[PDB]
């Protein structure tokens, strides 16, 4: 039966070929005759050739339908692959007949899912460009299959990601997220955007297409798989969304999600908020206005020693406690929502270096508010900051530990101490811990930012006569005179102030 029809498929008369195509299709519908077609590598080559070369609507439907039935089995998937069926199927994607299109996209889906070598074959056949072009179709079930194909092709393949970008992929995918409500489609499209959102080229494009706001629409959808993929993609994109506006709604939802029972939801919300509030005074304002400080302190308390939650949450708190209209109110709110004890706790083991760095920065900002000077002292912040500083300095003098340079710890701790030293009782504590020798040694640091905070803390201390004499006794006049000529105006200003107080 099989070689008879293979001879009729290779006929010079196309009429004979058309009649043979309808017969081969009906045979693919039964299991006995289907395995017969799959066992013959000469029959499968004829079906592929018939499909690619036919100009007849029915023959294209029957040859594509036949190949679809083979794709249900491992033997048939291997047959279509070895018979060069992938480029033939790709050609069928330009078909104005829906039934031909639906056979091709589903067969290609099956090949991409279970057949080795198929992802490379589809790329080489120009499949990516054809698939991106079809994203203007309005059938949500077809769109769901097409987008899933793009996900398979883009995953772990920076080449494919770049092609999707060039073909207007980001804009088309964002449109789907703004236009449809069909969950299965929203979810598959969000998975494509997730894959693309780790690409340094695709990321600014997705953000420019309005991807942050589009993904924000679906954060309260009942579907948890859709919410989570939106959250992952949002986190990936969030470091490139600094200039975006129309973010009020997203920012409000993210604060709400901080109270979620899902730790993955909490982690992502904290991380997105952290990125979006980094040096964006308008976003800082919005997050504070919708109860962001309270939400973040509660998050830090509940998270305990889970640093995947506390690190982004503490970073967000650091951003929200400086350089915006409501910064003062936020500094106070951290105290009023019982946050100061837990913030000091995070300076201690088992906290790793990324979290310690963030916590020190937050304490530095908290100390800008005088009402936090005494509670920070009472909660034990000064001795721990000094211990951190002393050891960090030693580590630099001997020589990235957990991605963090110990210079960053020196600068951070000295900076926090510089701000805490505005209070008279804090200066007593700082001086009593024998810090002046270390602060004077820091004047000789190659790093200008360290010289600035070291000079600043010495400047605060020297306002008390006893401390000024100790600073002088440490031979500080020599480094300080040299620092008067620093290209850093902050260093030079502070050095002059210390020298002044040492001369009376």
């Amino acid at each position: 039966a099989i070689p008879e029809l293979t001879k009729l498929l290779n006929d010079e008369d196309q009429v004979v070929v058309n009649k043979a195509a309808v017969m081969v299709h009906q045979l693919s519908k039964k299991e006995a005759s289907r395995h017969a077609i799959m066992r013959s590598p000469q029959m499968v080559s004829a079906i592929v050739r018939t499909m690619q070369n036919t100009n007849d609507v029915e023959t294209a439907r029957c040859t594509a339908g036949t190949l679809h039935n083979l794709s249900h089995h491992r033997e048939g998937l291997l047959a279509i692959f070895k018979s060069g069926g992938i480029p033939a199927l790709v050609k069928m994607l330009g078909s104005p007949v829906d039934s031909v299109l639906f056979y091709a996209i589903t067969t290609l889906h099956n090949l991409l899912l279970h057949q080795e070598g198929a992802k490379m074959a589809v790329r080489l056949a120009g499949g990516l460009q054809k698939m991106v072009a079809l994203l203007n179709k309005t059938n949500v079930k077809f769109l769901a299959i097409t987008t899933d194909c793009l996900q398979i092709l883009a995953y772990g393949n920076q080449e494919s990601k770049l092609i999707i970008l060039a073909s207007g992929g980001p804009q088309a995918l964002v449109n789907i997220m703004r236009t449809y409500t069909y969950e299965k489609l929203l979810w598959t499209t969000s998975r494509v955007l997730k894959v693309l959102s780790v690409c340094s080229s695709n990321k600014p494009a997705i953000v420019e297409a309005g991807g942050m706001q589009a993904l924000g629409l679906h954060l309260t959808d009942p579907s948890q798989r859709l919410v989570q993929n939106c959250l992952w993609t949002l986190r990936n994109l969030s470091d490139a969304a600094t200039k975006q506006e129309g973010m009020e709604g997203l920012l409000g939802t993210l604060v709400q999600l901080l109270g979620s029972d899902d730790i993955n939801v909490v982690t992502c919300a904290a991380g997105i908020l952290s990125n979006l509030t980094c040096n964006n005074y308008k976003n800082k304002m919005m997050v504070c206005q919708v109860g962001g400080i309270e939400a973040l302190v509660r998050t830090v308390l509940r998270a305990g020693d889970r640093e995947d939650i506390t690190e982004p949450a503490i970073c967000a708190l650091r951003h929200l406690t400086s350089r915006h209209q409501e910064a003062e109110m936020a500094q106070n709110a951290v105290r009023l929502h019982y946050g100061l004890p837990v913030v000091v706790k995070l300076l201690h083991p088992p906290s790793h270096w990324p979290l310690i760095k963030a916590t020190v920065g937050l304490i530095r900002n908290l100390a800008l508010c005088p009402a936090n000077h005494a509670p920070l002292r009472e909660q034990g912040a000064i001795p721990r900051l000094v211990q951190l500083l002393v050891r960090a300095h030693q580590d630099t003098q001997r020589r990235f530990v957990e991605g963090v340079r110990m210079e960053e710890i020196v600068e951070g701790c000295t900076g926090a101490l510089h701000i805490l030293a505005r209070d008279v009782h804090n200066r007593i504590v700082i001086r009593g811990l024998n810090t002046i020798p270390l602060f004077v040694q820091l004047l000789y640091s190659p790093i200008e930012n360290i010289q600035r905070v070291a000079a600043g803390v010495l400047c605060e201390l020297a306002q008390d006569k006893e401390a000024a004499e100790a600073i002088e006794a440490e031979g500080a006049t020599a480094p300080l005179t040299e620092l008067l000529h620093s290209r850093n105006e902050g260093v030079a200003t502070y050095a002059a102030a210390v020298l002044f107080r040492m001369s009376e």
Binding site: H68, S99, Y103, T106, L113, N139, K141, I145, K184
Partner: peptide, 11 residues
């Protein structure tokens, strides 16, 4: 019909 059938099979 092919679409419904395929959706069910895959997901």
């Amino acid at each position: 019909x092919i679409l419904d059938x395929h959706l069910x099979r895959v997901w």
